[PDB]
Ligand binder design. Structure first.
Ligand SMILES: [Br-]
Ligand SMILES: [Br-]
Ligand SMILES: [Br-]
Ligand SMILES: [Br-]
Ligand SMILES: [Br-]
Ligand code: NA
Lengths: 311, 311, 311, 311, 311
């Protein structure tokens, strides 16, 4: 089989469409997601044209091997898609209607800067490489782009599934390549992060601040050091759910900042005891009383500054 | 091969049946389950009619490639089912009896609100796409829907396996689709959660409350902070067995509430010591004595309120 | 190809045998094990009979596609077995000798009640579905049932590999089914559980009891609370190696019971300090002295009771 | 099909090229990385030569089975590459232009000595075994060696993708082998290691040094031992992200050195208390005051020594 | 196809060879390793003999399906090897030279008694089953047994790759079987275990012994209990890298023995405080002073005894 010959110099337009059936396994660490969808393809092959009156049929059904089919590939896939051809139908004017159901693991980079209050634009890049006989260009049939109502991505809200209608045409190894961008916009369901990570992390920090209403150095050391250990536990838990980023994430920034609060609390606790031993408790009392206001105030202002910088 | 021709304008009815052989790997985090079952299909293809007198045999056995077979698919599967054809029997009128044994990983959403006292309705959606020559509709042969007596799903009780007899017929990408809903009702075996998570979590909480019968601030700090650390360990253990939900789970609610009890216990322990140092122990004694009754009472009432809200 | 015709309605007997080459990956949590074995099949096909004096050949070697072979399946397998046909031999009377080497992941429930002093009976269920022309029944050729001497299952002792010679013949979806039960009896190697889990768990518990020879409340709180944290660590480690059971395991029972011992030790430590503060140390001394005998005695008797209930 | 015959006592030159589409899953522990790329092959087959004037065609398209294709393999791959032929084009002189898109998991050793400030040279070794009729040699077509601009490897910076133009020709099992070395140079994005591992590890160490401004032995023991436990947590976290090396890594060296600082801090804390009890506090004061300067100074100098030895 | 006929009473000798290309993924817990190697086979088939003069060829190439090839299998493999035929060459006398490149996951038991200072002998068992027409025996062609210089197994040193030249001929399911033993000798790279597990474990133990220079019971309890918790952490870390053995490992023995040292240290700390409270400090001083020498001495001697018993 060979591609359809150009009636005019015109490049062959392959109309595309992706209909999402299932969305699952968005892996944050791996920056991948699995998809189960319909891929629809449509093009004019004049060699396949027929008269409906003479043939006694209005449609002609072929097997993939019987006719020429464009080699459509995904750019950002781990392995080649697991595809099953559903139907191939030819209209009297030679308009081919191809439909396949596929499943694929898609590589799509994620921006964790606002984690866990982040939104992502997942991409599915459709591509076709031109043949020596003729140039192949991709198009979007908006009527065949969509998603099933039941499509759910665990821990995320699915906003939209649209396609950038104008393809990105470029040269790769002296052949024309036509690339389409299918975009799946999602926003993270941040709810669970509040009672599981944010509030427990705040409680242990506030517990460390009870040392500002205590003169017992031994108890203060126990308060600040023990809660710091609990904070290390949360820092480690958080970084296991996330990949290593060359930037600070919003949660990573808060977690890092809380270490400084534990560090300064230890200094205060040390200074208080040192002055007490040195028989200067009136001075130690001034520092401790100031710390009661300074620590929550600086914590609140530093968080306002961070939320501003990130959102 | 092409579909059987209609005697009139009627759609082709494909009678279905699923018989569960094995149920395994219900993944809570992934919201998936693996299934090993028989898929039975039955349709009339008069082009396969034969005389038993002439052919000698009463029933004809065919290879899947030799005859037309409906393209039956599962909606909610990760990848296409691993299927092995067991039998294809054609009777003299042309009635085909197809039997295959398959294995598949099914995507079925789970409601964790009442975890670990939750029940689920797992779905297996059977689907067929209509062709150009004629429309294909699915039906349920109740005689061929069931499950093996030995079918066990680790950590769950299997209640029923039934099928919604009326298919969901709808248009998808300019063609008819016939969808059947096979429902597997299961209830969680909550037993192990009691001695492994609930009771150890209660013991450490009750241990923190021994600080209400102690005047030693340094020992009280050790009691409440150490048990809080143990509670953090249990919170982390619990959330590793569960996906991130945009709602509170029953266990998640209890675990979160227990943090407030640790926080208020720290306040009490702090207040008690502060008054003692301030030479007001009669007042500290009133707060500590009240706490001995208040903490278990408020804990019991708050748990009654939570159990009411969730069940 | 069609099945061998009967002299009478008498069913076709397919003699079976399984010879284990490799046993590996017994997954306790998944309740699965991987097997690499020989599957031998034998039946009489008179259509394949030949004369021994005329032919000169004593045995004829056929390719699987050339002759009729019964569709033999495993009931309790995750996916269809990975099989490679080794040899097909036909004797003059038409007796077929089929041999294949296969690998499969088998689902076999495990009873953890006596863990880690448990024994299991792993099952490999062989099954054949009857055809319209005639009924197929399974039989055991005991001479072709066995295991390689080198067969080792990491952390287990392999006792026996036998087959229940009488098949379970039953109707399933209007056809006869013949099921054979191949049983692999194994007993757990409990050795490693003693120095890794049982003895370290006992040492930390005995360390908590040194608080019965101490009047220092602050040190006692540190002793009982710290060792309790170490016990939580072991409880969590143990439950990661085991699936969730709707019953108590022997180890789970001991681990749960030890929590009560930590709880009562905290009560004693609290009561001792309360009486001391209340200027009643002679009474506190009576309780502490009693606890020195009571705690090891009640621990020993409670363990005798548990071992009795479980074994 | 047979290889193209030599015009002269010459080997067949197969011009190669690799164009990276996707780079993902660099596993540090496994020392592997996954690749999705184009593999281009070019060789002269005079048997396929044609006249462009009479044929009217500039290029002829062949199916892989229709013509002879060299058996090109990768040396350092886990399993054989998952390949899909994109295009086969023959010029009038008989020059064949082969293009396939493949995916493979590549084994490439990693040097962790300067971790997490390390750089690596990943290798993709192309190989061809000579046939009995003639010797096959590999060459690099630099015009077909490259990478997509969007190629991202999570947690790494991609520097270059070049090929060693001269193949390594050698005898293997009494035949010639032609090996090409494709090199992917990458440098680790160390950023995240600073707020997640390096700075928290420094904070806990500095917290332990507050014991040099405290005379309370009980509080000092709590300070140095608690922070040591937090350091063990970080040591364990670090070694889970890395494979076991027969050499010291830069991070491993720092982590190991910090143990000595905790050990000497315990000795100081012990010596201070011992002298205090021995009624020699003037001496204990001299050691404690010296430790305030000695510990940060020795820590800074030892780190300068280590950074010098490693970089 | 049928096996080559015997000239005489002689069995068919199949000369074998394995050339290791890649060695990876030695899983200690699973007792498996992955291999990528060349498998060479050689046997005489007189039916394929030819005269070089009238043929014009010194060698003849065949496709695997065209000629009889012995069914060579691996005994200790998880699943059947992933094999690709590289070349099949026939010399004038009919000597067939077969070469395939394969990848397989091999089951090979490991002896952990001297871990992490252990050495292993990995096995690759080649096997062939005899046919009714004639007995097939295996042989080793030492010229075709080897390994690539670049073959590296992460965390191990590869010593040798040799084959036991004499096959193990035996009966299995009424047919003779010829088994060859290919041995890969490896020794563990113990280096990393010293700064990561052995020395940190020794430091925490030595820190617990500072309690022998302290009269503060509260601080002593904190010293011995906290370091014991750190030792539990290391015990758990070690047992996650190892399978459960029915014997003691060298590391397991040290780790277990260190628990006894923590236990006796707690007894000493308890005894010291008890005597102090009882107004007998001169006696407590004698026990504490003795413990300063006894604990390091008994630890050193017990380790010499253990190293002797294990090496
Ligand atoms: Br693709
Ligand atoms: Br499906
Ligand atoms: Br099976
Ligand atoms: Br390859
Ligand atoms: Br094999
Ligand atoms: Na303390």
């Amino acid at each position: 089989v060979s591609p359809p010959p150009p009636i005019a110099d015109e490049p062959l337009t392959v109309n595309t469409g992706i209909y999402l059936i299932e969305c699952y396994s968005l892996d944050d660490k791996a920056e991948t997601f699995k998809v189960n969808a319909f891929l629809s393809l449509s093009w004019k092959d004049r060699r396949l044209a027929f008269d409906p009156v003479r043939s006694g049929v209005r449609v002609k059904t072929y097997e993939p091997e019987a006719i020429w089919i464009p080699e459509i590939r995904f750019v950002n896939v781990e392995n080649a898609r697991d595809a099953d051809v559903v139907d191939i139908s030819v209209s009297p004017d030679g308009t081919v209607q191809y439909l396949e159901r596929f499943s694929a693991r898609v590589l799509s980079p994620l921006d964790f800067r606002r984690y866990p209050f982040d939104s992502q634009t997942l991409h599915i890049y459709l591509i076709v490489r031109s043949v020596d006989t003729r140039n192949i260009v991709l198009a979007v049939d908006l009527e065949k782009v969509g998603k099933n109502d039941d499509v759910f991505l665990t821990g995320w809200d699915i906003e939209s599934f649209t396609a950038v209608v104008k393809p990105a045409n470029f040269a790769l190894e002296d052949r024309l390549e036509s690339k389409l961008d299918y975009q799946l916009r999602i926003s993270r369901q941040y709810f669970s992060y509040i009672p599981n990570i944010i509030l427990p992390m705040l409680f242990i920090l506030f517990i460390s601040w009870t040392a500002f209403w205590s003169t017992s150095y031994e108890a203060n050391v126990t308060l600040v050091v023990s809660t710091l250990i609990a904070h290390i536990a949360f820092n480690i838990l958080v970084e296991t759910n996330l990949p290593k980023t060359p930037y600070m994430t919003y949660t990573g920034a808060i977690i890092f900042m809380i270490y400084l609060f534990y560090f300064v609390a230890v200094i205060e606790v040390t200074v208080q005891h040192y002055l007490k031993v040195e028989s200067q408790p009136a001075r130690a009392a001034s520092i401790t009383r100031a710390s009661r206001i300074a620590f929550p105030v600086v914590f609140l202002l530093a968080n306002i500054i961070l939320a501003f910088l990130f959102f």
